[PDB]
From Swiss-Prot, chain A:
Domain of life: Eukaryota
Protein name: Elongin-B
One Pfam family cited in the UniProt record for this chain: ubiquitin
Modified residues (N-acetylmethionine): 1
Modification sites for Phosphothreonine: 84
Organism (species): Homo sapiens
The protein's annotated pathway: Protein modification; protein ubiquitination
Quaternary structure and interacting proteins, as annotated: Heterotrimer of an A (ELOA, ELOA2 or ELOA3P), ELOB and ELOC subunit. The elongin BC complex interacts with EPOP; leading to recruit the elongin BC complex to Polycomb group (PcG) target genes, thereby restricting excessive activity of the PRC2/EED-EZH2 complex.
Curated annotation (Swiss-Prot), chain B:
Consequence of substituting residue 93 to L: In VHLD; type II
UniProt-reported outcome of changing residue 40 to G: In VHLD; type I; requires 2 nucleotide substitutions
Effect of residue 117 to P: In VHLD; type I-II; common mutation
Gene it is expressed from: VHL
Protein name: von Hippel-Lindau disease tumor suppressor
Domain of life: Eukaryota
Outcome when changing residue 106 to G: In VHLD; type I-II
Gene Ontology molecular function, alphabetical: DNA-binding transcription factor binding; enzyme binding; molecular adaptor activity; protein serine/threonine kinase binding; transcription corepressor activity; transcription elongation factor activity; ubiquitin-like ligase-substrate adaptor activity; ubiquitin-protein transferase activity
Any one Gene Ontology cellular component term annotated for this protein: microtubule cytoskeleton
Result, substituting residue 109 to G: In VHLD; type I
Curated annotation (Swiss-Prot), chain C:
Record protein name field: Elongin-C
Metabolic or biological pathway: Protein modification; protein ubiquitination
UniProt keyword list: Host-virus interaction, Nucleus, Transcription, Transcription regulation, Ubl conjugation, Ubl conjugation pathway
InterPro entries referenced in this protein's UniProt entry, alphabetically: ELC1, SKP1-like, SKP1/BTB/POZ_sf, Skp1_comp_POZ
Species assigned in the record: Homo sapiens
Gene name in the database record: ELOC
A molecular function (GO) term: transcription corepressor binding
Pfam family, one: Skp1_POZ
A GO-annotated cellular component: Cul5-RING ubiquitin ligase complex
GO biological process: protein ubiquitination; regulation of transcription by RNA polymerase II; target-directed miRNA degradation; transcription initiation at RNA polymerase II promoter; ubiquitin-dependent protein catabolic process
Function of the protein: SIII, also known as elongin, is a general transcription elongation factor that increases the RNA polymerase II transcription elongation past template-encoded arresting sites. Subunit A is transcriptionally active and its transcription activity is strongly enhanced by binding to the dimeric complex of the SIII regulatory subunits B and C (elongin BC complex). Core component of multiple cullin-RING-based ECS (ElonginB/C-CUL2/5-SOCS-box protein) E3 ubiquitin-protein ligase complexes, which mediate the ubiquitination of target proteins. By binding to BC-box motifs it seems to link target recruitment subunits, like VHL and members of the SOCS box family, to Cullin/RBX1 modules that activate E2 ubiquitination enzymes. Component the von Hippel-Lindau ubiquitination complex CBC(VHL).
Length: 104, 141, 87
């Protein structure tokens, strides 16, 4: 079963899919192909939780019914600058304006 | 041009609403005119009596947004084989993002205030040109 | 796979498949690997990128199609974006 993901780090936001049966490490390989950083320099998160390389996305809560195309699930990403890992930072999206008078 | 064939060969049908909208079945009668039928709530079905060669199409009851029936615009009852009804699956189309954005904007603003919105005059004309059954029958024809 | 970068007014960088972004004729022209949008904020452009995924998933499928959701707060800005993008 396909799961649909937003992988997020600072202002970067990848949109991709993976199988529910695929691993966290396999998703890191996908990030490697796009952002040119290998799995060892990567750290994937679900909310505040670090994920383990050998665990499937399904085991980490990404199911085909929560991680939908129209409303995909977020996966935090953090890089290693040489020595140690940076803190997980996801820049929030912009604020919408106030609902105009006519839309209330 | 688009009219039901007056065959008088009965055809039993299941209108099955696999959409989140309240569905309004529209029969195109023998002189071309759209006749409305009772509404189907979302996820409900009705076993109905129609005839072969009759023409139906399906709309959102509240906004007249177009729905599909068996992947297409129009549904025609075929011959019942095995004494068994023909299945008529009413579903959403994959609307364009633009038309979907129009639907939501239409559902939040009343017709009077479309001109007050801060958008191009091309979009007032798209907003006011709401889905309509006579419009679509002229296209198909 | 082949990816492209779509950049919002506020500097957010959305990386999506090239197939998905070519849905929009405007983006295809803007390419023919990154495309900066001066007028589309990130809260709008993420819904656009969600719509691409949605549209590629459910086009040519007899599975029940769900309603593509749009919050009331972002409907005007998304309308204006789709009208520009033609998707
Ligand atoms: C002689 C002839 O064919 N007369 C037409 C008016 C007729 O009887 N029709 C046209 C269509 O083929 C359907 C049929 C008809 O009206 N059947 C009765 C009917 C009643 C309600 C319903 C519906 S539609 C949604 N819910 C219901 C209960 C469907 C069919």
């Amino acid at each position: 079963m396909d799961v649909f993901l937003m992988i997020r780090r600072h202002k970067t936001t990848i949109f991709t899919d993976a199988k529910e049966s695929s691993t966290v490490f396999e998703l890191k390989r996908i990030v490697e192909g796009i952002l040119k950083r290998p799995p060892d320099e990567q750290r994937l998160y679900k909310d505040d939780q670090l994920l383990d390389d050998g665990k499937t996305l399904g085991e980490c809560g990404f199911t085909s019914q929560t991680a939908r195309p129209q409303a995909p699930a977020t996966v935090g990403l953090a890089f290693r600058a040489d020595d140690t890992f940076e803190a997980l930072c996801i820049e929030p999206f912009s604020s919408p304006p106030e609902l105009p008078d006519v839309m209330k | 041009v688009l009219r039901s064939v007056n065959s008088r060969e009965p055809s039993q049908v299941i209108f099955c609403n696999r959409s989140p909208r309240v569905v309004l079945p529209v029969w195109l009668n023998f002189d071309g005119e759209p006749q409305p039928y009772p509404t189907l709530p979302p996820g409900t079905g009705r076993r109905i009596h129609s005839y072969r060669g009759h023409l139906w199409l399906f709309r959102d009851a509240g906004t007249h947004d177009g729905l599909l029936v068996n992947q297409t615009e129009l549904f025609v009852p075929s011959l019942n084989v095995d004494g068994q009804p023909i299945f008529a699956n009413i579903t959403l189309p994959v609307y364009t993002l633009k038309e979907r954005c129009l639907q939501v904007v239409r559902s939040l603003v009343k017709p009077e205030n479309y001109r007050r919105l801060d958008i191009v005059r091309s979009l007032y004309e798209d907003l006011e040109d709401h889905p309509n059954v006579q419009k679509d029958l002229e296209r198909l024809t | 796979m082949m990816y492209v970068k779509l950049i919002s007014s506020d500097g957010h960088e959305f990386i999506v498949k090239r197939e998905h972004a070519l849905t929009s004729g405007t983006i295809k022209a803007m390419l023919s690997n990154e495309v900066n949008f001066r007028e589309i904020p990130s809260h709008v452009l993420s819904k656009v990128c969600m719509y691409f995924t949605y549209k590629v998933r459910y086009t040519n499928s007899s599975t029940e199609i769900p309603e593509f959701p749009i919050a009331p707060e972002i409907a005007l800005e998304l309308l204006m974006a789709a009208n520009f993008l033609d998707c």
